[PDB]
């Protein structure tokens, strides 16, 4: 009955725990105890991008590492040329409370979404000369957190109703849905091979998902409150999370257990955004203390600080060629660092 | 500088002027957050205010803009993300009073909303809705059949009204950094904007004077 099934589940949980514990032959700190510290990193502003009238909430780099899109809580997207601080496009939105954006790999489309529970896909190359909306995707029952392109016809969507979805843009209907969380979901990221993707869900738990099948393969635990950010390591078999516990964590998908913890005693504010670097050596994170911190991933120490903003930092991004870093905060300014 | 980046710079300047045309409107805007109930007649109130997931309304009173946000029953969201209404200056709460059996339910929502951290520097404007069925029910159905702490007679309207206001007011922990306001409206449909206007003006003056008093 119910009791026998619960006992079998407990036995399986004990099996999983024993398997996880048996593989802990070493810690991450002991293997890398002979690697030279990075020293000190003193980055500086190269350009300051001005023009927004409210708080920035998301940004995304392009595939050529020269163009970018930014979005704020006044209903506007701006496409900037970062070399000459030119404005290439300004697109008005239909709703003002919008919480995500993305940049299609081919350079033809963009996306946005928020509290209206609908995801909008915009087309850039037109014979008439304007940027006009192409698709509206609807079907969720809760607010929209993140959305990322996969191809020119397939998109991925995560909401706060405990589900995730894969959409075919041409037709306009879901092809597969992912269920299995308890609380609402906040962030997701995609592997370089574009076959799997990971997401965290405000229950101190994270899950890895398979696209071609529709089933959840594995989940990890360890935090104590919400999860606010997640990112992929370049090789596609690792990830890192930040939480409102002011604690950052690094997990691996083949060890099936937690690997590293980043924490300090003078920090009492949570993490809003996390991103990686080209070689995986710099782990960058924005905090609620009005600044951003540059961590050495393989050491779990403080390598640098970026302290140029006058409010909370909520957007962080890194280039595809490794030449720049971009930050956006509640002060209505974007900054480019090199 | 290359006969084609000059045109790009001109394009960017045009876009800059188009953006800067809107700062003078963004800087003079007042936001209110509206909360109510399914039986509280929110739609009738909105219609009578001569206005027009989430609904937005924009209007103006005496040359001042106003924006109102209607949350279509999403109050089930109880996480910090949903507290992105930190720019709001007032929360407007419509509550029913003729259907006694639901009153308790409303309080359970009320105590949940006004005790959050982000709303400690904002004002609350309370409307007790329609407030005329009581005039025809207090002599028919006693208010003691649902509550026990009432002391007055079932028929005098003033005692019941004072009791209701006290019960609503006693739900605030560290009651108020900015005061609570309340009114009685049935079908007035004409004077509500003036009351909202005066209360918002008082809150903004409160903040201005506190800023001026820097010793």
């Amino acid at each position, epitope marked *: 009955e119910l009791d026998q099934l619960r006992q079998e589940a407990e036995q399986l949980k004990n099996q999983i725990r024993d398997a996880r514990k048996a593989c802990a032959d070493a810690t991450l700190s002991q293997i890398t105890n002979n690697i030279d510290p990075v020293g000190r990193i003193q980055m500086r502003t190269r350009r300051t991008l001005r023009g927004h009238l409210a708080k920035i909430y998301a940004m995304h780099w392009g595939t050529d590492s*020269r*163009l970018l899109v930014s979005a704020s809580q006044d209903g506007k997207l701006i496409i900037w*040329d970062s070399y000459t601080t*030119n404005k*290439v496009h300004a697109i008005p939105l239909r709703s003002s409370w919008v919480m995500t954006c993305a940049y299609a790999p081919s350079g033809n489309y963009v996306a946005c979404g928020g509290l209206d529970n609908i995801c909008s896909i915009y087309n850039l190359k037109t*014979r*008439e*000369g*304007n940027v006009r909306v192409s698709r509206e995707l609807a079907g969720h029952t809760g607010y929209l957190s993140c959305c990322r392109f996969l191809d020119d016809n397939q998109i991925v969507t995560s909401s706060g109703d405990t589900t995730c979805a894969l959409w075919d843009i041409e037709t306009g209907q879901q092809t597969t849905t992912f269920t299995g969380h308890t609380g609402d979901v906040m962030s997701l990221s995609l592997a370089p091979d574009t076959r799997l993707f990971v997401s965290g869900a405000c229950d101190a738990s994270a899950k890895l998902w398979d696209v071609r099948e529709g089933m959840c393969r594995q989940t990890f635990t360890g935090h104590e409150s919400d999860i606010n950010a997640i990112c992929f390591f370049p090789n596609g078999n690792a990830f890192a999370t930040g939480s409102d516990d002011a604690t950052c964590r690094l997990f691996d998908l083949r060890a099936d257990q937690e690997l590293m913890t980043y924490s300090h005693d003078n920090i009492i504010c949570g993490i809003t955004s996390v991103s990686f670097s080209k070689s995986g050596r710099l782990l960058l994170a924005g905090y609620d203390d009005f600044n951003c911190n540059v961590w050495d991933a393989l050491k779990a120490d403080r390598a640098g600080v970026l302290a140029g903003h006058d409010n909370r930092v909520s957007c962080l991004g890194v280039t595809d060629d490794g030449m720049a870093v971009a930050t956006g905060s509640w002060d209505s300014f974007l900054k480019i660092w090199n | 500088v*290359s*006969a*084609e*980046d*000059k*045109a*790009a710079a*001109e*394009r960017s300047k*045009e876009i800059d002027k188009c953006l800067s045309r809107e700062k003078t409107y963004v800087k003079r805007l007042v936001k209110i957050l509206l909360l109510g109930a399914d039986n509280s007649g929110k739609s009738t109130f909105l219609k009578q205010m001569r206005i027009i997931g989430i609904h937005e309304y924009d209007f103006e009173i005496k040359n001042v803009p106003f924006k109102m946000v209607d949350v279509g029953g999403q109050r089930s969201e109880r996480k910090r993300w949903f507290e992105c209404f930190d720019s709001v200056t007032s929360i407007l709460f419509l509550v029913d009073s003729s259907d006694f059996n639901r009153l308790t339910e409303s309080l359970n929502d009320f105590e949940t909303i006004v005790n959050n951290r982000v709303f400690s520097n904002v004002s609350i404007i309370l409307f007790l809705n329609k407030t005329d069925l009581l005039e025809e029910k207090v002599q028919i159905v006693s208010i003691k059949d649902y509550f026990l702490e009432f002391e007055g007679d079932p028929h005098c309207l003033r005692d019941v009204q004072k009791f209701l206001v006290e019960c609503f007011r006693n739900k605030r922990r560290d009651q108020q950094q900015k005061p609570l306001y309340h009114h009685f409206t049935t079908a007035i449909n004409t004077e509500n904007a003036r009351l909202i206007f005066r209360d918002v003006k008082d809150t903004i003056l409160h903040d201005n004077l506190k800023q001026l008093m820097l010793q």
Partner: single-chain antibody
Amino acid sequence: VQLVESGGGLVQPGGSRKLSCSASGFAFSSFGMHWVRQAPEKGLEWVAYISSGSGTIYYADTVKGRFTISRDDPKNTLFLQMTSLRSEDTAMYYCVRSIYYYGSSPFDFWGQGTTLTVSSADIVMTQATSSVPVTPGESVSISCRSSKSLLHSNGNTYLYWFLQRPGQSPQLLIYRMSNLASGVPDRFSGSGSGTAFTLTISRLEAEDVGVYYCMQHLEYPLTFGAGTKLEL
């Protein structure tokens, strides 16, 4: 899109004339306009340039002070006015659209033109030859020369390849010396060394004949070449 011009005719010496262009199908308030001329039996020459926002105007050296260029955004109509015509102003005119931002393709859509009859820092181009007999199935390379380097400091190159089929308006073949415009077969290419450039066509077929032109856009004014005619 679509552009329709009007205002041609036959004039007596002295007097004035006016030409108009009307647009349809696109956002005329975000584009820039050029007026180009053509001799009855010879190459092309730039006449005037106006830009969106009405900020800059450039005129030609041979006709400055007699002509005036103007636009009207809400009605989508462009005007050119000319005075005191001589026998050296017998020609056939065309309008051209171009847009400049990061990644654009200027000189994409050409109109249909009209006819008008009257009773040392510039870079000079020279066309290699006037006629080259070819046969279907072969490949062809057509080259022209310049007098100064066309590579600006920021990685660009400014030479444009257009084609004029018999009895039609010009169509863009290559913009910025190495790219390919929309709506064109994928068998064209372009390459060359500093100041000496060449367009390559493979698998010569029918309706692939005409006269080919190479144009420069580094610094006003714009200057054309003689043109090269192809015989299949």
